[PDB]
Amino acid sequence: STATDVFWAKYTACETARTPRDKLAACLEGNCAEGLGTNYRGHVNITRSGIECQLWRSRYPHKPEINSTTHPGADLQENFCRNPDSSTTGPWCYTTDPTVRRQECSIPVCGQEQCVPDRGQQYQGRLAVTTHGLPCLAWASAQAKALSKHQDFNSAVQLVENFCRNPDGDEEGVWCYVAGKPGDFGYCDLNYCEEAVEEETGTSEYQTFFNPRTFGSGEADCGLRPLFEKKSLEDKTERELLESYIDGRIVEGSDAEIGMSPWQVMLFRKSPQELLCGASLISDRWVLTAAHCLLYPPWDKNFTENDLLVRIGKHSRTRYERNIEKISMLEKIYIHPRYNWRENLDRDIALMKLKKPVAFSDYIHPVCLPDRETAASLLQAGYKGRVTGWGNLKETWTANVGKGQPSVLQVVNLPIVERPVCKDSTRIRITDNMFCAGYKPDEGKRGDACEGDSGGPFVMKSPFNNRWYQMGIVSWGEGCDRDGKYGFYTHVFRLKKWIQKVIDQFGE
């Protein structure tokens, strides 16, 4: 009979709520939403945007194609929000408003206060689907065992059926493999404990991370500039970085010295000839940029490998610099799997492989990427960063009706804003994966915030080992809109194990 099915239906629907079983409790009594909330049994009468829900048993204004006799499971009663068809938008309802057939409702999420520690390293739940709702493959399955033992894992981490787990110490969190090419994978959506890297505290010498084979060469020798560090010469404003605690005048953006930012990349549209975004160069072979530069639906954008070209070692915005710049095509583009623009530019990061490794010159050298430890260390001892670019951010996101785009790579140094100060400043929700930067607007402490290139680099130089580290990727920031506000930058310290898996889908 169905009554025994109903009991189990509830159970299977609440499968992802575990550690507190005062959370599994709160799930099963349907008053809040787990996952796509097919567990929801609450009494929210009202859609997310104000409207009264229609009665499930009504046919005015809308004649439902989902009724209690097609979905006898779902408790399609009165006019309460339910999710009878498993909408990836969660529990919904028909609208009493003749112009809107359906709208999602706004239902409290189950377990909200509960919080997962240590990036899912001790996760033992049964979550078996990534963030895009792509089902996990079993770890057991042929490829993941008898062929992927070379990349070994931590075995305090029990790999069980096809549940999201974090075996390889991934700073992004738990993950699992998915249907497609060999090695394909995704991140799963657990609710991680917010951990502000700036207030971490407790590196010795430099020690390398990926192989000179698949990540390519350059890692061993990153962050040192041919024309500066290697000639032991100092650049015109790096002193502000090392003396970042000193209350200085405010050195405005000026033209960069040649070779000053040799990891600077330009993402460039084939046709029409057009400067699209910025990016940085992290090996002979890989390029780091922001995901909105390739995929951003509100702007009806969706580039592929064949539409674009990078330009490396440029100094002049416009002139073709023939002795100097190498200008490469793309083999593959990797949007970060966690990337999401629907709420607000989360994990707005993208990796790009070059069809052919580029040769380091006086003007082409890779920047270093830091890990958690180092990133934290750097933020503890350094209070300003550097953003270099061709003012593409200002030219992309505002009318720029002012003076025009600069004609040479620009350098500027910007203060790093304290997390809470940055939180209050914006309507948008700054996760621990973002940081703000820019001067705190006084009239003797002015504001020109919207600096750099979209998806370009924000860097810091290490006072421990003299190398330059890339600490965030420029994204859109409120500072492009309102004179008082800050630049927004996507942290990079969590990326090593993701890059790792991306490079592992190769072999040669």
Ligand SMILES: *[C@@H]1O[C@H](CO)[C@@H](O)[C@H](O)[C@H]1NC(C)=O
């Ligand atoms: C919401 O449903 C409950 C349950 O009967 C009722 O008391 C309340 O007045 C209803 N309001 C709307 C807008 O449906």
Ligand SMILES: *[C@@H]1O[C@H](CO)[C@@H](O)[C@H](O)[C@H]1NC(C)=O
């Ligand atoms: C429920 O709606 C379907 C959808 O067309 C309709 O044909 C049917 O008459 C309804 N079910 C029952 C059992 O009356």
Ligand SMILES: *[C@@H]1O[C@H](CO)[C@@H](O)[C@H](O)[C@H]1NC(C)=O
């Ligand atoms: C954008 O275009 C590519 C290539 O045609 C396509 O495969 C992909 O489905 C599109 N992107 C998204 C996010 O749907």
